[PDB]
Amino acid sequence: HTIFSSLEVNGVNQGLGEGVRVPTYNGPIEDVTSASIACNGSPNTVASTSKVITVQAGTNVTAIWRYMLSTTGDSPADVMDSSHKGPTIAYLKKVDNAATASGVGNGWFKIQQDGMDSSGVWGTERVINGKGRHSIKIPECIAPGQYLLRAEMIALHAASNYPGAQFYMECAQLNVVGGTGAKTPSTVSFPGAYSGSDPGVKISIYWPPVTSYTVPGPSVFTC
Ligand SMILES: *[C@@H]1O[C@H](CO)[C@@H](O[C@@H]2O[C@H](CO)[C@@H](O[C@H]3O[C@H](CO)[C@@H](O)[C@H](O)[C@@H]3O)[C@H](O)[C@H]2NC(C)=O)[C@H](O)[C@H]1NC(C)=O
Numbered sequence: 001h002t003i004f005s006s007l008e009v010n011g012v013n014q015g016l017g018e019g020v021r022v023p024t025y026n027g028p029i030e031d032v033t034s035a036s037i038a039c040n041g042s043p044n045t046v047a048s049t050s051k052v053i054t055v056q057a058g059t060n061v062t063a064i065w066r067y068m069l070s071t072t073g074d075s076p077a078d079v080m081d082s083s084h085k086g087p088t089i090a091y092l093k094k095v096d097n098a099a100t101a102s103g104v105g106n107g108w109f110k111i112q113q114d115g116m117d118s119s120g121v122w123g124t125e126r127v128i129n130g131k132g133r134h135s136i137k138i139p140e141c142i143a144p145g146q147y148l149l150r151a152e153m154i155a156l157h158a159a160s161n162y163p164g165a166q167f168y169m170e171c172a173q174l175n176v177v178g179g180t181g182a183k184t185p186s187t188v189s190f191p192g193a194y195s196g197s198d199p200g201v202k203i204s205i206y207w208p209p210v211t212s213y214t215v216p217g218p219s220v221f222t223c
């Protein structure tokens, strides 16, 4: 249970719910076929925001994850419960207007992931123990313009069967400046990219103990 509730750009937090479409409730999405897998949604309620955050291509934004919207601390229990082991992921989607576009459909490409490392430490643990900081590099070679940023943590502690995986995601509204447009990504759809039978979605992380993990979705886009 966790919420991506603010974005940091160049050392500066842009504000709670400012340019990030936040739900009030920190519960997961569980159905990978639901339109809610894109930018959260029903049975949650998601707030709108008219703020679009300007970001320089080639630099990093930081998604800031908190247990609740009211949370003010940054210790592990203020981010997410440490049972919630799994990957962190981030995607971009070019849109005409980042304040009104839904996220649902084709256009997403993956720009960041952190699965399980050699020491069996998971991406989510690095965020939990890293003050909730999920750092994501905006590619330098993409076309400038309006984008949605989808930042995600997947908790796999109850994912032996499907449904079981817990998907925590929110979408931020960006204006990417300075991109060269040198490369055009191949894209996937949400819903569509993840299936219930994917080996990184339906997985027992205890029996046997995992030493390699396949993060779901397409491969990472690089310049
Ligand atoms: C900007 O965002 C980048 C992600 O999109 C991020 O890159 C990642 O940084 C981490 C650590 O800084 C790297 O992780 C590993 O490095 C060594 C082996 O490579 C390990 O010993 C560490 O434990 C750690 O897991 C990621 O590999 C790296 N990913 C990529 C694609 O470069 C940058 O750190 C972010 N930059 C800033 C300034 O925040």
Ligand SMILES: [Cu+2]
Pocket: 001, 002, 081, 084, 166
């Ligand atoms: Cu939870």
